[PDB]
Amino acid sequence: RGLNVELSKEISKRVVEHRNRFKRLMFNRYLEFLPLLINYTNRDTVGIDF
Amino acid sequence: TRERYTPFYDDRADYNTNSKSYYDYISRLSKLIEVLARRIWDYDNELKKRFKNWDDLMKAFPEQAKDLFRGWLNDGT
Amino acid sequence: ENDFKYFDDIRPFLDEIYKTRERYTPFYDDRADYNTNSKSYYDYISRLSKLIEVLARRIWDYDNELKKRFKNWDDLMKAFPEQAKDLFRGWLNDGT
Amino acid sequence: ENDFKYFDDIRPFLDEIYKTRERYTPFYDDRADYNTNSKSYYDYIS
Amino acid sequence: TRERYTPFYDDRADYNTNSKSYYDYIS
Amino acid sequence: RYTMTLYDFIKSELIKKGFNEFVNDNKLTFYDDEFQFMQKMLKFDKDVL
Amino acid sequence: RYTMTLYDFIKSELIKKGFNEFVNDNKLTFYDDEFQFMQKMLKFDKDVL
């Protein structure tokens, strides 16, 4: 075992983790969505996985 | 996660860094390793010359051993 | 004999910490937020600084030790013809 | 002979910095924002 | 990026520029 | 934010001057009150002075 | 904003006057407290004066 916790300004590391995880999440979510906006009269007759 | 300092220990190393900040002490320590590195280089410059001298004597030893032994102090012995 | 009870007077103080070691949580509390202050960078270069100067001096003064060690080389060189003639007068004793 | 232990008394102070050189991150912290002041133009024309 | 002054060193050059500013010393 | 303390300073500088607190003469002296450094700083003897 | 300091001034002007702190006589004098400049400014001897 190994344990000796910092303080309860652990929150001041939890706060910056929330910021860092929010940037990572919002960035890759926004490009997770962005390649589907158009879809253009979806598969009328044409064999394309749009 | 949950950044903990799980060791919490005792030390035996000593310090009075005659320096304005951490920064200027880093500079001083840089100068110091530079000057003792130059000391190692003049150890090399001395020592290559010493071994160009010495190993000649260790290579040319038996010829010198035949040569100096024939000196004519032998009658005194 | 029934001697060497030095393994035995430890017993009432070796069961004791085993008693009060792991039965704590009905007796104590977990509060109050004790602060922990542990060793910034200045203690790190403390740990490094004495350590580097204690070999910085001990490679600065390598020259006088090495000066001794290539002094006694030449001491051996100036002692060698004496040892050669001393070796020579050994064998001619039986030789003559 | 078993002489010239000048390569050898360095050993307990050459393993030491190798010990305390790279095992630091459970023992120390990364905070406090030390300022660095480094040499403006006046030291350059110095 | 992230402008760092990765050397931080010691100097051996000397200065008393008998001049009002940097500018007048350049002159 | 954390830097050097002042207890650690005079402790390390007094231990530079040959002192110790655990194995001082030969006997285990961790518990003996006239040897560990905190008592030398609270008594504030000639040495810490 | 950064310009000249004042420690650097009298350090450079004292090193203009033949002094040094590393290789002063011939021996390595970086660790010796009576030679590096910070002690000469805190003691504030005749020379810095």
Short mmCIF file of C-alpha atoms in Angstrom, two decimals, chain C:
data_model
loop_
_atom_site.label_atom_id
_atom_site.label_comp_id
_atom_site.label_asym_id
_atom_site.label_seq_id
_atom_site.Cartn_x
_atom_site.Cartn_y
_atom_site.Cartn_z
CA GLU C 1 16.97 -24.49 30.51
CA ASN C 2 14.04 -22.09 30.66
CA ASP C 3 16.16 -19.08 29.81
CA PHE C 4 16.16 -16.41 27.05
CA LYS C 5 12.86 -14.67 27.70
CA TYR C 6 13.84 -11.80 25.42
CA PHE C 7 11.55 -13.24 22.73
CA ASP C 8 8.90 -13.25 25.47
CA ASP C 9 8.80 -9.82 27.11
CA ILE C 10 8.15 -8.46 23.62
CA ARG C 11 4.86 -10.43 23.61
CA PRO C 12 2.75 -8.05 25.79
CA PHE C 13 3.93 -5.21 23.54
CA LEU C 14 3.51 -7.15 20.32
CA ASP C 15 -0.07 -8.18 20.88
CA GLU C 16 -0.75 -4.59 21.94
CA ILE C 17 -0.14 -2.91 18.60
CA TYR C 18 -1.95 -5.77 16.91
CA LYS C 19 -4.90 -4.95 19.13
CA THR C 20 -4.89 -1.18 18.66
CA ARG C 21 -3.76 -1.36 15.04
CA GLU C 22 -6.85 -2.46 13.11
CA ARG C 23 -9.77 -2.06 15.54
CA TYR C 24 -9.80 1.72 15.35
CA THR C 25 -12.95 2.83 13.51
CA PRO C 26 -15.49 2.58 16.38
CA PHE C 27 -13.14 4.54 18.63
CA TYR C 28 -11.90 7.46 16.54
CA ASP C 29 -13.10 9.88 13.87
CA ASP C 30 -12.26 10.99 10.34
CA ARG C 31 -12.45 14.77 10.25
CA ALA C 32 -10.55 18.02 10.74
CA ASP C 33 -8.54 18.20 7.45
CA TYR C 34 -4.93 18.00 8.54
CA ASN C 35 -2.68 19.88 6.17
CA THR C 36 0.34 18.19 4.64
CA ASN C 37 3.36 20.24 3.58
CA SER C 38 5.82 18.20 1.56
CA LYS C 39 9.03 19.44 0.06
CA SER C 40 8.96 21.82 -2.91
CA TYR C 41 11.70 22.24 -5.50
CA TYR C 42 14.04 23.97 -3.08
CA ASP C 43 14.28 20.83 -1.02
CA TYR C 44 14.82 18.93 -4.25
CA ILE C 45 17.89 20.92 -5.15
CA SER C 46 18.82 20.62 -1.50
CA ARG C 47 18.85 16.87 -2.04
CA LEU C 48 20.89 17.37 -5.18
CA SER C 49 23.20 20.24 -4.20
CA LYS C 50 25.17 18.72 -1.34
CA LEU C 51 25.33 15.55 -3.37
CA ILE C 52 26.90 17.28 -6.34
CA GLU C 53 29.33 19.41 -4.34
CA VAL C 54 30.52 16.42 -2.31
CA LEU C 55 31.74 14.90 -5.56
CA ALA C 56 32.57 18.21 -7.22
CA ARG C 57 35.29 18.75 -4.64
CA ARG C 58 36.22 15.09 -4.86
CA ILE C 59 36.91 15.41 -8.56
CA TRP C 60 38.52 18.80 -8.19
CA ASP C 61 41.09 17.28 -5.85
CA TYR C 62 41.75 14.32 -8.08
CA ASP C 63 44.78 16.12 -9.48
CA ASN C 64 46.87 15.91 -6.33
CA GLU C 65 46.10 12.21 -5.87
CA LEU C 66 46.94 11.59 -9.53
CA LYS C 67 50.03 13.76 -9.07
CA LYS C 68 51.11 11.41 -6.30
CA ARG C 69 50.38 8.46 -8.56
CA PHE C 70 52.53 9.71 -11.43
CA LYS C 71 55.15 10.88 -8.98
CA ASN C 72 55.74 7.39 -7.66
CA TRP C 73 56.04 6.11 -11.24
CA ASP C 74 59.15 8.24 -11.64
CA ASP C 75 60.18 7.23 -8.13
CA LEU C 76 60.11 3.66 -9.39
CA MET C 77 62.08 4.72 -12.47
CA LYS C 78 64.84 6.30 -10.41
CA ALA C 79 64.76 3.32 -8.06
CA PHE C 80 65.07 0.79 -10.87
CA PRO C 81 68.86 0.73 -11.67
CA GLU C 82 69.51 0.23 -7.96
CA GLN C 83 67.15 -2.75 -8.00
CA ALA C 84 68.76 -4.06 -11.19
CA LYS C 85 72.28 -3.96 -9.76
CA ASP C 86 70.96 -5.39 -6.50
CA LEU C 87 69.43 -8.25 -8.48
CA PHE C 88 72.70 -8.69 -10.33
CA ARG C 89 74.81 -8.98 -7.18
CA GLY C 90 72.46 -11.71 -5.99
CA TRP C 91 73.16 -14.30 -8.66
CA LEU C 92 76.92 -13.78 -8.99
CA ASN C 93 77.23 -14.72 -5.31
CA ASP C 94 76.53 -18.30 -6.34
CA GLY C 95 78.07 -17.44 -9.71
CA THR C 96 81.58 -16.60 -8.52
#
